[PDB]
């Protein structure tokens, strides 16, 4: 409970209002946040019906040992031109300095803004104190459905409620404006698969080898590799994720790779970087791909497809057996301003 009062003196002035938030373990078990003291938190908000980006801020968080119990934080709220927007996502990014861990925790303002509603000369001495009492108010996250607590500390204040500026007509439906990100990436993924299915039609519904890997002679195995391509089309369409590989390729300033979990036998790991491999498409460059430990098991093994994305937004779908199909993510110039603003 110290991290609320620390942030009001260092993150506090650099914002407009703070959202004091305490996360219970039921929220921590869902988003899988391993509570070590090494964790660096980073916060930024994604605006709507405006050019969407706010600056990134580092917020301190401490475990509260016991009346709730859990991780304690403070979220920034930004008021451009004197008011809040209701449909305006505040993104919490959790990462460790050394290891491989990146988690995105997303909050909406209407779950926070509503939850806030009820002789030598003298030098001043103002230390950080937990003397101010807390008023615990309940909330639910819209995205996960796990409850989290909100503090309200005591200090033209009691006269007015918290200003909101609701959107104006014509407006898309707020089930579609809340999930602005998951309906943008899903249509890019569904247009990525349509390039792969068009590439089979120009070749005559075939799958050509690219990687020299010997195949044991059985007719059921030749039917099994075909089943890896159709299952990967059920996955790439159904996948709509914030941290996909092509998004890192669009906001890169190097090949970007993410393996897949076919038939739900694995969870997806997204955004793996190929450091030191230049995907030029020549037969010299595929050997540098094969030195990776992932690509050897996506091809010799089974149940895992693999997607390798160039910085020119051209991507191959690597199947087990060495088969590959060139595809292309189509991102317009208006779309790249939308992606590099909110994400990168």
């Amino acid at each position: 409970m110290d991290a609320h009062a620390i942030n009001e003196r260092y993150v506090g002035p650099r914002c407009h209002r703070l959202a004091h938030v305490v996360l219970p373990r039921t929220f921590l078990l869902h988003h899988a946040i391993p509570l070590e003291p090494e964790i660096i938190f980073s916060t930024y908000t994604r605006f709507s019906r405006s050019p969407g980006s706010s600056r990134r801020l580092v917020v301190c968080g401490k475990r509260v040992l016991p009346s709730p119990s859990g991780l304690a934080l403070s979220l920034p709220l930004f008021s451009h031109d004197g008011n809040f927007h209701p449909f305006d996502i505040s993104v919490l990014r959790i990462s460790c300095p050394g290891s491989n861990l990146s988690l995105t925790v997303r909050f909406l303002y209407l779950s926070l803004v509503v939850a806030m509603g009820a002789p030598p000369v003298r030098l001043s001495f103002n230390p950080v104190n937990a003397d101010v009492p807390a008023t615990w108010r309940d909330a639910t996250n819209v995205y996960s459905g796990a409850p989290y607590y909100v503090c309200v500390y005591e200090r033209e204040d009691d006269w007015l409620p918290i200003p909101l500026s609701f959107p104006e007509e014509p407006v898309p439906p707020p089930p579609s404006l809340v999930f602005m990100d998951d309906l943008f990436i899903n249509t890019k993924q569904c247009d990525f698969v349509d390039t792969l299915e068009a590439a089979c039609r120009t070749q005559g519904y075939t799958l050509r080898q690219r990687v020299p890997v010997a195949i044991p002679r059985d007719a059921e195995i030749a039917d099994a590799v075909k089943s890896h391509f159709l299952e990967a089309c059920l996955v790439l369409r159904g996948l709509a994720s914030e941290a996909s590989a092509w998004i890192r390729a669009a906001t890169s300033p190097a090949c970007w790779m993410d393996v897949l979990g076919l038939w739900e036998s694995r969870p997806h790991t997204l955004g793996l970087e190929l450091r030191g491999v230049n995907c030029g498409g020549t037969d010299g460059d595929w050997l540098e791909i094969l030195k990776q430990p992932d690509v050897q098991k996506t091809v010799s093994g089974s149940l895992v497809a693999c997607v390798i994305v160039t910085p020119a937004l051209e991507a191959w779908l690597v199947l087990p057996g060495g088969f590959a199909i060139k595809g292309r993510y189509r991102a317009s110039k208006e779309d790249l301003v939308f992606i590099r603003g909110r994400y990168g």
Binding site: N186, C190, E197, C200, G204, Y205, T206, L207, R208, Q209, R210, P212, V213, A214, I215, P216, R217, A222, V225, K226, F229, L230, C233, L234, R237, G238, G322, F323
Partner: peptide, 29 residues
């Protein structure tokens, strides 16, 4: 015996089973 690697090895994909897979992906989204 294993097959030898060669860039002309093909796997012929059926037209109906690729489109019946397209029907499932519409509904699950």
């Amino acid at each position: 015996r294993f097959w030898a690697p060669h860039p002309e090895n093909v796997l012929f994909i059926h037209k109906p089973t690729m489109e019946e897979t397209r029907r499932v992906a519409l509904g699950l989204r």
